[PDB]
Write an enzyme that holds these catalytic residues in place. Structure first.
Site, PDB file in Angstrom:
ATOM      1  N   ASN A 202      21.611 -63.873  -5.289  1.00  0.00           N
ATOM      2  CA  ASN A 202      20.241 -63.498  -5.564  1.00  0.00           C
ATOM      3  C   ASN A 202      20.178 -61.977  -5.557  1.00  0.00           C
ATOM      4  O   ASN A 202      20.509 -61.351  -4.547  1.00  0.00           O
ATOM      5  CB  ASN A 202      19.330 -64.109  -4.495  1.00  0.00           C
TER       6      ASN A 202
ATOM      7  N   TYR B 172       6.926 -55.435  -9.971  1.00  0.00           N
ATOM      8  CA  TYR B 172       7.168 -56.183  -8.758  1.00  0.00           C
ATOM      9  C   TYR B 172       6.762 -55.339  -7.586  1.00  0.00           C
ATOM     10  O   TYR B 172       7.199 -54.203  -7.451  1.00  0.00           O
ATOM     11  CB  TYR B 172       8.645 -56.565  -8.647  1.00  0.00           C
TER      12      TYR B 172
ATOM     13  N   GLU C 121       3.380 -60.757  -2.122  1.00  0.00           N
ATOM     14  CA  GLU C 121       4.436 -60.386  -3.052  1.00  0.00           C
ATOM     15  C   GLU C 121       3.867 -60.607  -4.438  1.00  0.00           C
ATOM     16  O   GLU C 121       3.462 -61.717  -4.747  1.00  0.00           O
ATOM     17  CB  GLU C 121       5.680 -61.251  -2.842  1.00  0.00           C
TER      18      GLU C 121
ATOM     19  N   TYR D  31       3.902 -60.111  -8.849  1.00  0.00           N
ATOM     20  CA  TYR D  31       4.742 -60.044 -10.034  1.00  0.00           C
ATOM     21  C   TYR D  31       3.904 -59.944 -11.275  1.00  0.00           C
ATOM     22  O   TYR D  31       3.025 -60.772 -11.500  1.00  0.00           O
ATOM     23  CB  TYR D  31       5.601 -61.283 -10.193  1.00  0.00           C
TER      24      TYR D  31
ATOM     25  N   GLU E 207      15.625 -59.129 -11.945  1.00  0.00           N
ATOM     26  CA  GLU E 207      16.028 -60.112 -10.957  1.00  0.00           C
ATOM     27  C   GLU E 207      16.946 -61.114 -11.612  1.00  0.00           C
ATOM     28  O   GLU E 207      16.748 -61.462 -12.760  1.00  0.00           O
ATOM     29  CB  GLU E 207      14.818 -60.830 -10.367  1.00  0.00           C
TER      30      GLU E 207
END
Length: 189
Positions: free
Chosen positions: A43, A75, A84, A86, A175
């Site tokens: 990740n 992000y 969080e 996005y 990502e």
């Protein structure tokens, strides 16, 4: 366990995080430029931007090529509450907002964005292992260059009851998750 590598490069804040360093090459270039190449296991998330974030317009361009689970997004995080967020510009074989609860839509910067919220339980955050919400704006028309009016997203989120806390970092992030891909991106304002 795994802290993000953070610092400054080219007049931008940057953050690079991976739980599997041998699977990924992250590089800071000049100005707002950064590149990431990954494959196989792990990740990985990295990119350049601002510490702290705000409602700025973010311009970006470059090459983003996902081969599997991956996204290209503005992000960031907020605190109080822990969020969080996005603004997803592009992604691969898998919508990262999957399983999010759809809260509405917003037309901005030449596409419609679908708005979702999800809860992540007992997960890594800017404050260690925590439970927090994820806010998503997901671009229907995928792209790898353009302008993102973050304030327009924040306001749209607010209009559907997704209130933000105080800003922590804000980056143009690439990502990858147990996938392959590469990108060479440049951020600016």
């Amino acid at each position: 366990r795994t802290q993000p590598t953070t610092g400054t490069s080219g007049g931008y804040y940057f953050s690079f995080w991976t739980d599997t360093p041998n699977s990924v090459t992250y590089t800071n270039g000049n100005g707002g430029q950064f590149s990431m190449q990954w494959s196989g296991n792990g990740n990985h998330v990295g990119g350049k931007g601002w510490m702290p974030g705000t409602s700025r317009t973010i311009k970006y361009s470059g090459s983003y090529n996902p081969n599997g689970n991956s996204y290209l997004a503005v992000y960031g995080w907020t605190r109080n509450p822990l969020i969080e967020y996005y603004i997803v510009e592009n992604f691969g074989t898998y919508n990262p907002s999957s399983g999010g609860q759809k809260k509405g839509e917003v037309n901005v910067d030449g596409s419609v964005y679908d708005i979702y919220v999800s809860t992540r339980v007992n997960a890594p955050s800017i404050d260690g292992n925590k439970t927090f919400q994820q806010y998503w704006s997901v671009r229907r028309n995928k792209r790898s260059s353009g302008s993102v009016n973050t304030g327009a997203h924040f306001q749209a989120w607010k209009n559907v009851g997704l209130n933000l806390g105080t800003h922590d970092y804000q980056i143009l992030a690439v990502e990858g998750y147990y996938s392959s891909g590469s990108a060479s991106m440049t951020v600016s304002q």
